[PDB]
Amino acid sequence: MGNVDLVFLFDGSMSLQPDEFQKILDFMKDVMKKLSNTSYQFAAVQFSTSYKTEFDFSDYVKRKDPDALLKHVKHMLLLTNTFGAINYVATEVFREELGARPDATKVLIIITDGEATDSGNIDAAKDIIRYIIGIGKHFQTKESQETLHKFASKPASEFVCILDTFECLKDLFT
């Protein structure tokens, strides 16, 4: 492999209890910590109705403090426009001026529900490896996780998993 540009696109909608949201922040922080000092570069974008880049690549390499980079994050508590969110990342976040690296393989970790409030196509992010982490309890049947497949890369079994175990990210660490 080599250097990769990972972007956390996290669900900041009204469906999450203040607890679940905090679990997402902790999850993100922990993912970043396990990948400290590696070829990885991060950026986080909270989505809901609108999309906000909490911190981008250039911010990461300058601070390298997950906890600090997510200190100011405030729960939006609005809709769940996942489609526009993925498009937002593809065209607005992965930008060289924002700290991205041309040679770096683009990765996107969508920490969400799977229940989107918008339609559309994410054809702009086809070249981005997309993992999808599921928060909430309804992801308790392999058949219920199917709604998440439309956002993640193929095969779905390799890019879709739950936040409690995150069995789809354990390879990134090694």
Curated annotation (Swiss-Prot):
Q: In which tissues is it expressed?
A: Leukocytes.
Point out the glycosylated residues in this chain.
N37
- The residues covered by the VWFA domain are 5-174
PTM summary? In resting T-cells, up to 40% of surface ITGAL is constitutively phosphorylated. Phosphorylation causes conformational changes needed for ligand binding and is necessary for activation by some physiological agents.
| Subcellular compartments | Cell membrane
The protein's role, per its UniProt record: Integrin ITGAL/ITGB2 is a receptor for ICAM1, ICAM2, ICAM3 and ICAM4. Integrin ITGAL/ITGB2 is a receptor for F11R. Integrin ITGAL/ITGB2 is a receptor for the secreted form of ubiquitin-like protein ISG15; the interaction is mediated by ITGAL. Involved in a variety of immune phenomena including leukocyte-endothelial cell interaction, cytotoxic T-cell mediated killing, and antibody dependent killing by granulocytes and monocytes. Contributes to natural killer cell cytotoxicity. Involved in leukocyte adhesion and transmigration of leukocytes including T-cells and neutrophils.
Q: What is known of its domains?
A: The integrin I-domain (insert) is a VWFA domain. Integrins with I-domains do not undergo protease cleavage. The I-domain is necessary and sufficient for interaction with ICAM1 and F11R.
On assembly, the entry states: Heterodimer of an alpha and a beta subunit. The ITGAL alpha subunit associates with the ITGB2 beta subunit. Interacts with THBD. Interacts with CD226.
Q: Which family does it belong to?
A: Belongs to the integrin alpha chain family.
Q: What is this protein called?
A: Integrin alpha-L
Native species: Homo sapiens (Human)
